[PDB]
């Protein structure tokens, strides 16, 4: 519960600064939280499918990396 708000407002501030935002609005945080939640839902579902087919109930690093690979946001350094 309330984990969607777990990403604090200053954390989103730092994310924006890395992105390159100078002026940040107050409703940006909620939309960013929604985008993060949707992307996490997709990647987690893909990784869960990967680990279920393996008959392993533990989500492994290779499962998540392969899920990111299939989603078009392939991430490196973690096997797969």
């Amino acid at each position: 519960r309330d984990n969607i708000q777990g990403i604090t407002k200053p954390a989103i501030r730092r994310l924006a600064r890395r992105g390159g935002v100078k002026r940040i609005s107050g409703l940006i945080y909620e939309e960013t939280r929604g985008v993060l939640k949707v992307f996490l839902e997709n990647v987690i579902r893909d990784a869960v499918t990967y680990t279920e087919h393996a008959k392993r109930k533990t989500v492994t690093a290779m499962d998540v990396v392969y899920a990111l690979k299939r989603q078009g946001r392939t991430l490196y350094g973690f096997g797969g």
Binding site: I7, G19, L40, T58, V65, L75
Partner: protein, 97 residues
């Protein structure tokens, strides 16, 4: 110890956080959100440290790219501030929901 007009403090934070590379989204709240999301789907889920770190870094990269696109939309519109409509347009052009 000084407060300037809006932006020079913003420029300082931008320079600091572009000079820095460590994870901006904190690991514990992000992992808590991941576990909350995964609870609704499947029970008895164990996450590896590298798996959660991969989730965190991929989400950070996607968010930063979306922020770059939003900044491009605002600046092209001769605007500095970003509005939820800016993010809506950026995601509309990007193609990931």
């Amino acid at each position: 110890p000084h407060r300037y007009r809006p932006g020079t403090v913003a420029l300082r934070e931008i320079r600091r956080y572009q000079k820095s590379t460590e994870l901006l989204i904190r690991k514990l709240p992000f992992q808590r959100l991941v576990r909350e999301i995964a609870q609704d789907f499947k029970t008895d889920l164990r996450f590896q440290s590298s798996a959660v770190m991969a989730l965190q870094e991929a989400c950070e990269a996607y968010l930063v790219g979306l922020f770059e696109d939003t900044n491009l939309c605002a600046i092209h519109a001769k605007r500095v501030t970003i509005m939820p409509k800016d993010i809506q347009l950026a995601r509309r052009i990007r193609g990931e929901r």
